């Protein structure tokens, strides 16, 4: 054997074991979700409070690309930051040449092709992150989830990390119960609940909630962080549902 020792090597199955090993690093990471809504998207993430010494609200994990795209990821934090840094260069060069801000499907492929490129050679390591991202463009709202292999699809709801199966189960219920659609302000409250429900799979350390959102009506099509009254309103909603 030894097929798993080198990246870009096909096993007799036709599998790249190094990419499957990168997925194990993602599964080990904290829970992050994405909820597609009526006229935008909502991103939420679990931040494990390792110690009292961590400054609250001052270890931001969700990252903005351009002014209209939000990105959250689970697994190796640095890898995620590297991918967003690339995303920003791709989005900048698109706007530079074509004037218009990069569409989400266009942006999704730019990351997809970049992550896929890191499965072609043994001289590079696959990305140790599953990235949930999206925003609002001319064609409306888009939510995507990108995996170490370079595989991405459009999603109604997306979840990754240690509590992905708990989150996925809760996301599936929203899609079933809201066929006509979910509102931006509702999706923020739901996002909070699902993180709190997904925290049951990581319940040794207590955690800190972080939510962001793009909405054509609520945020004027731009990416903003949910803070202050709207954040505490979402936390209180989540606290009431677990009890």
């Amino acid at each position: 054997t030894g097929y798993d020792l080198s990246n870009s090597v096909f096993s007799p199955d036709g599998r790249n074991f190094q990419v499957e090993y990168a997925v194990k690093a993602v599964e080990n990471g904290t829970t992050s979700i994405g909820i597609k809504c009526n006229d935008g998207v909502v991103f939420a993430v679990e931040k494990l409070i390792t110690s009292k010494l961590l400054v609250p609200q001052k270890n931001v994990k969700i990252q903005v690309v351009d002014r209209h795209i939000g990105c959250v990821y689970s697994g190796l934090i640095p890898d995620g930051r590297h991918l967003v840094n690339r995303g920003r260069e791709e989005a900048a060069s698109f706007k530079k040449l074509y004037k218009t801000p990069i569409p989400i499907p266009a942006f999704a492929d730019r990351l997809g092709q970049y992550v896929q490129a890191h499965t072609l050679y043994n001289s590079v390591r696959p990305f140790g992150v599953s990235t949930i991202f999206g925003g609002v463009d001319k064609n409306g709202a888009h939510l995507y989830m990108l995996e170490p292999s370079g595989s991405y699809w459009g999603y109604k709801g997306a979840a990754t990390g240690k509590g992905r199966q708990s989150a996925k189960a809760e996301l599936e219920k929203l899609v079933d119960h809201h066929p006509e659609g979910l509102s931006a302000r509702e999706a923020v409250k739901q996002a909070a609940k699902i993180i709190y429900l997904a925290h049951e799979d990581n319940k040794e350390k207590d955690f800190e909630l972080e939510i962001s959102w793009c909405s054509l009506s609520e945020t004027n099509g731009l990416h903003k962080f949910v803070k202050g009254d709207l954040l505490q309103e979402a936390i209180d909603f989540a606290q009431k549902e677990i009890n």
């Binding site: 194990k24 010494l53 400054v55 934090i77 001289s123 696959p126």
Partner: protein, 231 residues
């Protein structure tokens, strides 16, 4: 075992062993403590010597008038990363006439360490850094790990027996955070914190290394007879 030959290889459980071995180099390193209030941020570093005839390895490096770090692990790697921070702090000043944010300083170190963990031939940095600074959003303390993970904290400690000082600061959190407009008392709290990581050895005049930055205080380092006050 078979997956620790280079940094480009993942283990079957999704671990980077070369990055973990680089993390191990920090644990062997001499203890250093970081803690801050709202007005000032303090670095305390236990310096290490080869023998009684040798000097004590300098742990603290100045990056700008408003920023600097303490090191634990490979000192040459700290020199490379500190030199990079100096250039980034300097680039911000010359181009934008702007003091580099301590948060951006962290983001830049994170991205520099990361590139060394994803490419063949290179190796991870073998040092951990505690960056303190005072910018437009007050006092800051960062913990840099060569995995790429940078964390903003009230207080922390890295190196051998750092768990002793880290437990003390976790107890003292509510006290030392409110030491505002009092440099000497914030240092005393830092010196008492690092004292919880000592075994057989005690803090002497050429052993202890303290650095402070704050509201009306440029980043300055205290060594020799200047730290005799705090023993």
């Amino acid at each position: 075992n078979n997956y620790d030959g280079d940094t480009v290889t993942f283990s079957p459980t999704g671990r980077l062993f070369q990055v973990e071995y680089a993390l191990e180099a920090i644990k062997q390193g001499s203890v250093t403590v970081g803690l801050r209030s709202n007005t000032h941020a303090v670095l305390v570093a236990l310096k290490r010597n080869a023998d009684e005839l040798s000097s004590y390895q300098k742990k603290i490096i100045k990056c700008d008038e408003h920023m600097g770090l303490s090191l634990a692990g490979l000192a040459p790697d700290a020199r490379v990363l500190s030199n990079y921070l100096r250039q980034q702090c300097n680039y911000s000043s010359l181009v934008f006439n702007r003091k580099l944010a301590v948060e951006r300083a962290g983001h830049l170190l994170c991205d520099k360490a990361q590139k060394n963990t994803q490419s063949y031939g290179g190796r991870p940095y073998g040092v951990g850094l505690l960056i303190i600074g005072y910018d437009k959003s007050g006092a800051h303390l960062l913990e840099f790990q060569p995995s790429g993970n940078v964390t903003e904290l009230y207080g922390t400690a890295i190196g051998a027996r750092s768990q002793g000082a880290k437990t003390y600061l976790e107890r003292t959190l509510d006290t030392f955070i409110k030491i505002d407009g009092n440099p000497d008392e914030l240092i005393k709290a830092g010196v008492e914190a690092i004292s919880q990581s000592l075994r057989d050895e005690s803090l002497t005049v050429d052993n202890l290394s303290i650095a402070i930055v704050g509201k009306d205080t440029p980043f300055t380092i205290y060594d020799g007879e200047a730290v005799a006050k705090y023993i």
